[PDB]
């Protein structure tokens, strides 16, 4: 027994996976098929902030920090709650970007640690460490990587510390972890 009900579907962004050089401009357009007139809005996935309403979002003079989540919201005014979202991930070309430059760890001497290192950049970077040992790479954002390495607390490591080097085809960035002890 047939039914005709209200709906919104097929929320498409264009371009789908934008790659832009720093300083260039980007124009994102949202599209949706639905059973009435629609309203459109743009969000900044990492924050709640609304950017511009309507189907097109115009960005200019892109810095590195403009990359990542943008979410289009395709709503119906006449039906509260009837919408659908679609995420677009913009990639800015740049060298690796360390999540932390210098940070400090409190440890005990008969201990092994799982240290971590985050970085961002396009193309997606890779990370290496200055101590021997196989590290595991977890990709979690088409531009972000989290490297994990197990080290044993030794006197020479308390002396030097430990540093992860995130590399990509556009350059390299580094980050160091200090190790300090029990009181």
């Amino acid at each position: 027994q047939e039914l005709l009900v209200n709906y919104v579907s097929d929320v498409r962004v264009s371009p789908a996976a934008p790659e832009r050089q720093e300083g260039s401009s980007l124009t994102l357009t949202c599209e949706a098929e639905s059973s009435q007139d629609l309203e459109f809005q743009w969000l900044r996935e990492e924050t709640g902030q609304v950017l511009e309403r309507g189907p097109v979002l115009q960005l200019h003079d892109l810095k590195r920090e403009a990359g990542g989540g943008y979410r289009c919201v395709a709503s119906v005014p006449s039906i509260p709650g009837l919408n659908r979202t679609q995420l677009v991930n913009v990639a800015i070309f740049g060298p690796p970007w360390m999540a932390f430059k210098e940070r400090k760890v409190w440890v005990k001497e008969n201990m092994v640690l799982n240290l971590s290192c985050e970085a961002s950049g396009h193309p997606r970077p890779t990370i290496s460490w200055n101590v021997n040992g196989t590290a595991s790479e977890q990709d979690q954002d088409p531009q972000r990587v989290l490297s994990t390495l197990n080290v044993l607390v030794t006197p020479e490591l308390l002396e030097t510390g430990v540093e992860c080097t995130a590399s990509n085809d556009l350059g390299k960035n580094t980050s160091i972890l200090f190790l300090e002890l029990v009181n």
Epitope: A16, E19, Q21, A91
Partner: antibody, heavy 118, light 112 residues
Framework: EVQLLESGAELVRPGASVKLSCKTS????????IHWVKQRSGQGLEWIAR????????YYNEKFKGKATLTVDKSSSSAYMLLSSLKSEDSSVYFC???????????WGAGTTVTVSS | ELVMTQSPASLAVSLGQRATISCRAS??????????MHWYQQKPGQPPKLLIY???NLESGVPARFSGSGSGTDFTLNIHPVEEEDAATYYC?????????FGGGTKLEIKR
């Protein structure tokens, strides 16, 4: 319009080498990667290597290490591949292709035929 | 390395119906919501031509008859409704790891 133009067909003796060229136009040459693929007798596609013209950084397929050498001349906005110590199994068509940070090939060259024969 | 298995190798579909080509990777080429699988079309005498990038996105200039879908290991190129000019060989390719590999290829024959 983005254009990738490859050098002419080649006749090389076994054991000798050849330097294929790929002259680019229509885009900032230092902002895109250049890849080379091999297609033998019209079927199949092998990825050989890639080079970034901005920083001269190259990554090779381990199948082709010692066979291919990727060079770039930013003056003429051209990428080059050097095939070394040729034998009959190298007689194929070699394409150059452009790519971004996601490593998919939007534009391809016409293809240089290489014949390795005495 | 990372192998791509295309099925079938040959495909004969009548004009106006649908062609469904499959591509299975030995390892997942999807991470973080991106599926690094791409599709190409190759006509005789011509180089490969990009159809679909990142599993599902249509390249500008490619008619809406072409569509791609899938995730992880399983991907499918759909052509509907097939026209005469669609007679070609179709390849998948991944950009998840290095080295980049291609599928074996699928040649589409058009019934008339």
């Amino acid at each position: 319009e983005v254009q990738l133009l490859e050098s002419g067909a080649e006749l090389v003796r076994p054991g000798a080498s050849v330097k294929l060229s790929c002259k680019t136009s229509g885009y900032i040459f230092t902002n895109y990667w250049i890849h080379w693929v091999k297609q033998r007798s019209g079927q199949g596609l092998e990825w050989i290597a890639r080079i970034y013209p901005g920083t001269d950084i190259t990554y090779y397929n381990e199948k082709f290490k010692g066979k291919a050498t990727l060079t770039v001349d930013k003056s003429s906005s051209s990428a080059y591949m050097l095939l070394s110590s040729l034998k009959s199994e190298d007689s194929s068509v070699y394409f150059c292709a452009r790519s971004g940070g996601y490593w998919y090939f939007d534009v391809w060259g016409a293809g240089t035929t290489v014949t390795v024969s005495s | 390395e990372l192998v791509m298995t295309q099925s079938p190798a040959s495909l004969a579909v009548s004009l106006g119906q649908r062609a469904t080509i499959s591509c299975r990777a030995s390892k997942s080429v999807s991470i973080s919501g991106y599926s690094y699988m791409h599709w190409y079309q190759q006509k005789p005498g011509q180089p490969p031509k990009l159809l679909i990038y990142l599993a599902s996105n249509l390249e500008s200039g490619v008619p809406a008859r072409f569509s791609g879908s899938g995730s992880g290991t399983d991907f499918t190129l759909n052509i509907h409704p097939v026209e005469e000019e669609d007679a070609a060989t179709y390849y998948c390719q991944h950009s998840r790891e290095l080295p980049y590999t291609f599928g074996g290829g699928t040649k589409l024959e058009i019934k008339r």
